[PDB]
Design a protein around this ligand. Structure first.
Ligand SMILES: Nc1nc2c(ncn2[C@@H]2O[C@H](COP(=O)(O)OP(=O)(O)O)[C@@H](O)[C@H]2O)c(=O)[nH]1
Ligand SMILES: [Mg+2]
Ligand SMILES: [Mn+2]
Length: 615
């Protein structure tokens, strides 16, 4: 068998045997074990620069940073090619793509057979959660992409320290990734190898993850969505914990009281910006700190509280829109040591994306850029054709420790107690700015039925409203109706301790006016909504009862520093009967599709809302 070049510190025979089997299938030219060091990261980056995948950015403008641009077919998640191959189709459910496991194995085996000819297999060891902690899980990703390897260094705890935890007998999550572009002897490679044919396949009974054809982070960083949401949610269902598509933030008010909240918004619908927001004018003495921006693992304790940890080590965030007004903590985070993907290149060797002009002299566009497709770009081109310099789903990858607002407990394996949950989709109509659920069951109803307009984070037509329960439509690892029951059962467990349950809120930053612009300013001004939630948590905030829950009056929010009138507030908080009647019919369609194992409590809650609308 091919020489594995196994390091001496790898003491795990079952792991080595699995690598041997995967090398025999994928047939790479050579095998490299990533140790996760800083020196190795620099060498792999230089390798990417030599291949043309990376351009090194100007050291004076953007220290130790790189720019990659991808094939236009490989810019986002591909939901139609993502599968949960559970033993029974009913354990995948209507929200997932299913295929009989033996039939998927026969589909993928010829694809992976020889997939890495002409390439190096990188062995990427990683821990999700702090290394060696009771809540952490170890994975091994085999990849033929050094781009995956360097991004995994930032997004996970990667490298040789993992094998100390694994030891001789520890188990691991097996992850296989190929760009699906084997190379003949003497064949010229492309700068972004990929395949038009893609599969991202999960086998829950074995915890196997197979990814073919994509180098895009959401499809190829297999610890992130594939393990820490899809596989982990199935483990949590069996073991009494949750894996959620949620940010976690800490907020401290001027009296020094600190609270933590977890918020589920769909991909590209505001989590990163909320998780590190800066309190605006009017909020002297408040502070917001970031635990995580994307994935949360949550379990109840005997004290009746819910404890959350962020299993990731970095941010893989949407770049367009980011500037010093919308997200200054992010702007400071990506000052250096960052990987940018599909943004534009300036004449001085820096990066640019739509939105950065708001910090520019005269708030003007740059005179010339090279766009993410390598084409010349100018403001005249932008004005005449609308060409985007940066792709709408362009990304930065940066270590969490670069964030000035990083919470001191961001990597504490004891977790933080969650005082409130927030759910919210991208909705141009119908949904008010903020609503508090009257009960846990009503809150689960709000999360189960939320809708959101599709975004550039996945392929397909953007701007289309769809149901996205708990912001987990692309990431739920088992039947969505059993997941609803899991949340209902968890609340009952918490209540039996005598505790007061965390409140559940719906939010909507994204109501549009007649010209299609946003009526609510959002970004830092979302602090004004968060401050109301804190008041409610403390039992000091007022609210008015309406059809879907409790909402603040104008006078219940702090408007110091923001010119936003009572009339503008009425627009984004009014409950419109006709719009909610239509919305409830869309809930009925979801419940029809999810009839199997649908908790009866959801139909009962829907019937009460219908009464309140006909009252
Ligand atoms: N209008 C508006 N846009 C926002 C807000 N928060 C984020 N965005 C934009 O929505 C896109 C995705 O935001 P991000 O925070 O990265 O969302 P995430 O993918 O859920 O982490 C970016 O273009 C942001 O500039 C907001 O409160 N209002
Ligand atoms: Mg994000
Ligand atoms: Mn996400």
């Amino acid at each position: 068998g091919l020489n594995l070049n196994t390091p001496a510190y790898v003491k795990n025979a079952k792991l080595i045997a699995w690598v041997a089997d995967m090398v025999a299938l994928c047939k790479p030219d050579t095998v490299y074990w990533c140790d996760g060091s800083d020196a190795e990261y620099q060498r792999l980056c230089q390798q990417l620069v030599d291949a043309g995948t990376f351009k090194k950015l100007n050291e004076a403008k953007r220290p130790n940073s790189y720019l990659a641009c991808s094939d236009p077919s490989d810019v986002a998640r591909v939901e139609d090619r993502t599968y949960i191959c559970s033993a029974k189709e009913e354990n995948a459910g209507p929200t997932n793509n299913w295929m009989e496991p033996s039939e998927m194995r026969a589909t993928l085996q010829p694809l992976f057979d020889g997939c890495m000819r002409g390439r190096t297999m990188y062995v990427v060891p990683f821990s999700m959660g702090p290394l060696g902690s009771p809540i952490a899980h170890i994975g091994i990703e085999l990849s033929d992409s050094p781009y995956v390897a360097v991004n995994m260094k930032i997004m996970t705890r990667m490298g040789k320290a993992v094998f100390e935890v694994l030891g001789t007998e520890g188990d691991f999550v097996p992850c296989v990734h190929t760009v699906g572009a084997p190379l003949a002897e003497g064949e010229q490679d492309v700068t972004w190898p990929c395949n038009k044919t893609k599969y991202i396949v999960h086998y829950p009974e074995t915890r196997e993850i197979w990814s073919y054809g994509s180098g895009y982070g959401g499809n190829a960083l297999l610890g992130k969505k594939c393990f820490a949401l899809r596989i982990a949610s199935n483990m949590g269902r069996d073991e009494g914990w949750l894996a959620e598509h949620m940010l976690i933030l800490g907020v401290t008010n001027p009296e020094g009281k600190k609270y933590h909240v977890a918020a589920a918004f769909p991909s590209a619908c505001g989590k990163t910006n909320f998780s590190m927001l800066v309190p605006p004018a009017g909020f002297d003495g408040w502070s917001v700190t970031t635990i995580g921006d994307d994935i949360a693992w949550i379990k109840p304790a005997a004290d009746g509280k819910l404890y959350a940890i962020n299993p990731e080590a970095g941010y893989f965030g949407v770049a367009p829109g980011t500037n010093m007004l919308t997200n200054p903590n992010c702007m400071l985070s990506v000052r250096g040591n960052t990987i940018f993907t599909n943004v534009a290149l300036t004449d001085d060797g820096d990066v640019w994306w739509e939105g950065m002009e708001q910090d520019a002299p005269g708030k003007a566009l740059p005179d010339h850029l090279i766009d993410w497709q390598g084409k010349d770009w100018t403001p005249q081109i932008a004005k005449e054709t609308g060409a985007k310099a940066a792709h709408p789903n362009s990304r930065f990858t940066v270590a969490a420790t670069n964030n000035p607002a990083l919470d001191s407990a961001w990597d504490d394996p004891k977790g933080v107690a969650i005082d409130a949950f927030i759910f919210g989709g991208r909705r141009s109509t119908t949904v008010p700015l903020v609503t508090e659920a009257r009960s846990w069951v009503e809150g689960v109803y709000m999360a189960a039925t939320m809708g959101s307009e599709t975004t550039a984070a996945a392929t397909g037509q953007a701007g289309v409203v769809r149901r996205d329960p708990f912001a987990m439509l692309p990431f739920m690892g088992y039947n969505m109706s059993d997941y609803f029951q899991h949340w209902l059962d968890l609340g009952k467990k918490l209540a039996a301790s005598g505790a007061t349950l965390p409140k559940i809120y719906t939010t909507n930053w994204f109501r549009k006016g007649t010209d299609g612009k946003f009526v609510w300013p959002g970004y830092g001004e979302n602090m004004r909504v968060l401050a109301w939630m804190i008041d409610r948590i403390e039992g000091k905030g007022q609210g008015e009862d309406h059809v879907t829950g409790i909402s603040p009056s104008y006078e219940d929010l702090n408007w110091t520093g923001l010119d936003f009138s009572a009339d503008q507030f009425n627009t984004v908080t009014s409950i419109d009967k006709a719009a909610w009647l239509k919305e409830l019919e869309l809930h009925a369609e979801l419940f029809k599709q999810l009839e199997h194992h649908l908790p009866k409590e959801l139909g009962e809650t829907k019937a009460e809302i219908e009464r309140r609308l006909a009252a």
